[PDB]
UniProtKB/Swiss-Prot annotation:
The active site is at K169. This is Cap-specific mRNA (nucleoside-2'-O-)-methyltransferase. It is found in: Virion. It catalyses: a 5'-end (N(7)-methyl 5'-triphosphoguanosine)-ribonucleoside in mRNA + S-adenosyl-L-methionine = a 5'-end (N(7)-methyl 5'-triphosphoguanosine)-(2'-O-methyl-ribonucleoside) in mRNA + S-adenosyl-L-homocysteine + H(+). MRNA binds at Y22, R171, C172, P173, W174, D176, S199, A200, E201, E227. GO terms for molecular function: mRNA (nucleoside-2'-O-)-methyltransferase activity; RNA binding. GO terms for biological process: 7-methylguanosine mRNA capping; methylation; regulation of mRNA 3'-end processing. Pfam families: PARP_regulatory (PF01358). Transmembrane segments: none annotated. GO terms for cellular component: virion component. Interacts with poly(A) polymerase catalytic subunit OPG063. Interacts with OPG109 and OPG123; these interactions might help linking transcription to capping and polyadenylation. Belongs to the class I-like SAM-binding methyltransferase superfamily. Poxvirus/kinetoplastid 2'-O-MTase family.
Length: 291
């Protein structure tokens, strides 16, 4: 058994203290172990991000614009969580595909079946006005050409929607498939527990202060680094059993998840953080129908 004692997990890409030469063979390895892992990955991360906003005093009263939301089965639990805490939020979910019916009939969530373009973003910006916006984008077209095009759109989202915070889907293209150096918004590289076994994807979380917009170039040397750190994490780290982690599940991912969950806010008071986390995990697993 691959055991170990860890103090804390790698919460952000910058914390990963080791790299590995990427082994193409890993592509053939089982990508997921849990049912609805996708909605799990999505929800913990989106819960983490939003709790922050709440912590910063910027969530309440905001309109959450989620682009690339369908099915968005998990979004429903998210919506209830803040709604039950008493935070006022309006959700505007947009996708060309259809949303999980559990999203319907809630007055505070508006579904839209529209593939957004730069033009559309301008009208939704005029119609949202003057509400403060929090943007969440998880749009997907894949080729580096596809990727760049997506990253380009996310950038036009922020420039037109002019949000107070954002969470963007972030996966660097692969160095052996580089096309050109491009810019992404400055934000924290949030590591996603329960992401596919060899996923190099994370979530870019940014808070927009002032009227400024800080970007950052991404070059192939960067793409090489992203590849090596993400492969070491996936291969080595994530397959770690945190034997000093006293929990129903000591596997890394749950250890990593405990850490994002211990930051989430609840109504019920617990004697310990073990209790709140066991509680929110159980709650979310039950919601997702995950054993
Ligand atoms: N990780 C995955 N791939 C390739 O990506 C393909 C799709 O797997 P994926 O990267 O998990 O898809 P996604 O990121 O779009 O969700 C695999 O078949 C591999 O060929 C990768 N290819 C390179 N060069 N480097 C990596 O770090 C890497
Ligand atoms: N311009 C566009 N506008 C909106 N959604 C888009 C888009 N281009 C791709 N997408 C959508 O992005 C989605 C990628 S999957 C997104 C999953 C969703 N966040 C969840 O909770 O399950 C797809 O449904 C796709 O239709």
């Amino acid at each position: 058994m691959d055991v170990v004692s860890l103090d804390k997990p790698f919460m952000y890409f910058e914390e990963i203290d080791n790299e590995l030469d990427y082994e193409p063979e890993s592509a053939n390895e089982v990508a997921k172990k849990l049912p609805y892992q996708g909605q799990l990955k999505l929800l913990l991360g989106e819960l983490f991000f939003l709790s922050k906003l709440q912590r910063h005093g910027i969530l309440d009263g905001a309109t959450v614009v989620y682009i690339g939301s369908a099915p968005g089965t998990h979004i429903r639990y998210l919506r209830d969580h803040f709604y039950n805490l008493g935070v006022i939020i309006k959700w505007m979910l947009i996708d060309g595909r259809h949303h999980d019916p559990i999203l319907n009939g809630l007055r505070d969530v508006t579904l839209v079946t529209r593939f957004v373009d730069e033009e559309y973003l301008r009208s939704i910006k005029k119609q949202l006005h003057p509400s403060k916006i929090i943007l969440i984008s998880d749009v997907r077209s894949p080729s580096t050409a596809d990727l760049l095009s997506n990253y380009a759109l996310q950038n036009v989202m922020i420039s037109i929607l002019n949000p107070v915070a954002s969470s963007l889907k972030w996966r660097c293209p692969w160095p052996d498939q580089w096309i050109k150096d491009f810019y992404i918004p400055h934000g924290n590289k949030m590591l996603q527990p329960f992401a596919p076994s060899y996923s190099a994807e994370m979530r870019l979380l940014s808070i927009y202060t002032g009227e400024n917009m800080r970007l950052t170039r991404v070059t192939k040397s960067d793409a090489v680094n992203y590849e090596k750190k993400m492969y070491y994490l996936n291969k080595i780290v994530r397959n770690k059993v945190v034997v000093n982690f006293d929990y129903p599940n000591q596997e890394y991912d749950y250890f990593h998840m405990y850490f994002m969950l211990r930051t989430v806010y609840c109504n019920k008071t617990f004697p310990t953080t073990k209790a709140k986390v066991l509680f929110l995990q159980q709650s979310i697993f039950r919601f997702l129908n995950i054993p």
